[PDB]
């Protein structure tokens, strides 16, 4: 499924770009530590998922 | 070339190698922010 | 009288030279002077 791989891959890019900015901002603002220690948590697992997803799909397109 | 599946990302792939030098510059932006204390 | 913080004017100024100079190194490969 071509467009489904390119969706999964840009999902990954977008989520990385969000995580690139928000993980260090979240970490150095303690006022909202617990506010966010689940957002990076869920980001991380989401991120890992897409890598695995983009990794398996690779074989049905490349 | 990249595989054709990933081709749309060629422009992103072309610019990724410069990113570690941005970290070096970023440290200086950061010190200007705290005024080189 | 101080309103805009110095580090921001430095980063912007800095990025502005990078562009202009980058452009000159581009021009070394394109158009006049490029051997082509």
């Amino acid at each position: 499924m071509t467009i489904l791989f390119q969706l999964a891959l840009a999902a990954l890019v977008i989520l990385s770009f969000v995580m690139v900015i928000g993980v260090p901002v979240a970490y150095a603002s303690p006022q909202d530590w617990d506010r966010s220690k689940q957002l990076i948590f869920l980001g991380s697992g989401l991120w890992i998922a897409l890598v695995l997803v983009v990794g398996v799909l690779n074989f049905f397109v490349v | 070339k990249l595989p054709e599946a990933y081709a749309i990302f060629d422009p992103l792939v072309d610019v990724l190698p410069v990113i570690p030098v941005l970290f070096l510059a970023l440290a200086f932006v950061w010190q200007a922010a705290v005024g080189f204390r | 009288g101080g309103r805009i913080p110095l580090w921001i004017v430095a980063t912007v100024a800095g990025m502005g030279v990078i562009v202009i100079v980058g452009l000159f190194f581009y021009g070394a490969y394109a158009g006049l002077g490029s051997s082509l």
Partner: peptide, 30 residues
């Protein structure tokens, strides 16, 4: 094309100063 490459790197390049920016606003631990 080259506007592709340049818009990538414009976005990646602003990503650093942004972190700094948002942490100074939200009075973070710079």
């Amino acid at each position: 094309e080259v506007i592709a490459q340049l818009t990538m790197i414009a976005m990646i390049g602003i990503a650093g100063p942004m972190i700094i920016f948002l942490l100074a606003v939200r009075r973070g631990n710079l």
